[PDB]
Amino acid sequence: VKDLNLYAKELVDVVNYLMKKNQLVFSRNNKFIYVNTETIKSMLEKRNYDTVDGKLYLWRELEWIECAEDRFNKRIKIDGENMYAVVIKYSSYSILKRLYLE
Amino acid sequence: VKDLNLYAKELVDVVNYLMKKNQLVFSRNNKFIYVNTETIKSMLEKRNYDTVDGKLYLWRELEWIECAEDRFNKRIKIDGENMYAVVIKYSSYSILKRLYLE
C-alpha cells in the first residue's frame, strides 16, 4: 500500500497497456503521452493499493505528469481534439522504464 | 530492479534528522531545502543498499534534488555568502513524507 514501486510500476504498465491496445497518443515533438481522462480513471481503479486521485496526486507531486492548476489534467490540442487529458512526460516514463528493467 | 522505497525513505529520514538538529536552511520561497554536501555524504554512508553516489544519482535522475552540470550539488547564496549545497526539492520531500504517513 505505502510502496512507491507500485506507483512507478503502474505508470510504466499504463503505457504498456495503451501500447498493446493501440491507443497510445504522442504529442508532435514526442515530449508527452496523452491519455483520455476516462481511460486513465478506469485503468487506475484495477489495483487497489490507492484510489485514482491518490495515484494522480502522487504522479503530479513527483512531476511524472503535467497538470493544469488544481486539476489532474491539462487542456491539449491533438489531431483536431482541443480538450482535457492526462499528460505523461515521456522523459519520466523513459527513466522509470529504464529503472523497471535494470 | 531497485527498491525505490529505500531511496525515498532515506530522503525523508535525512531531512527529518536535519530538521530536528536545526541543520537545514530553507530557500526564501520555501521551494528548496539546502544541506551541506559533506553532512549528506556522511549520512548516506550508513545504509548499505547502495553507494553514496548511487543514491545521489537516483535522486538526481528522479529530480528529487537540483544539481549543477555533472555535480550532485549546486552553488547557492545564504545570508550574502556563496557556497555549495545539496538542493532538495521541498515538494518531493512533502509527497514522500505524506506517502509514508498516510
Numbering used by the authors:
A (entry chain A), B (entry chain B): 1 to 102
Please share excerpts from the published article on this structure.
In the Gram-positive pathogenic bacterium Clostridium perfringens the conjugative tetracycline resistance plasmid pCW3 is representative of a large class of closely related toxin and antibiotic resistance plasmids. In this study, we have identified TcpK, a protein encoded by a gene upstream of the oriT site and tcpM, as being a major factor required for the efficient conjugation of the pCW3 plasmid. Our data revealed that TcpK was a distantly related member of the wHTH family of DNA binding proteins. Our data suggest that its function is to decorate the origin of transfer of pCW3 and to interact specifically with sequences that are only present in this region of the plasmid.
Most notably, TcpK contains a major deletion in the C-terminal region and lacks the domain responsible for the dimerization of MukF and other members of the MarR family. Macromolecular interface analysis of the crystal structure using PISA13 suggests that despite lacking the canonical MukF-like or MarR-like dimerization domain, TcpK is still predicted to form a dimer. The proposed dimer interface involves 48 residues for a total surface area of 866 Å2. These interactions are predominantly mediated through helices H1, H3 and H4. Interfacing residues in helix H1 consist of V1–N5, all of which contribute through an extensive network of hydrogen bonds and/or salt bridges. Surprisingly, the second helix of the dimer interface (helix H3), involving Y57, L58 and E61–W64, is predicted to be involved in DNA binding. Most notably, the canonical helix (H3) responsible for interacting with DNA in other wHTH superfamily members was buried at the dimer interface involving helices H1, H3 and H4’, and was hence inaccessible.
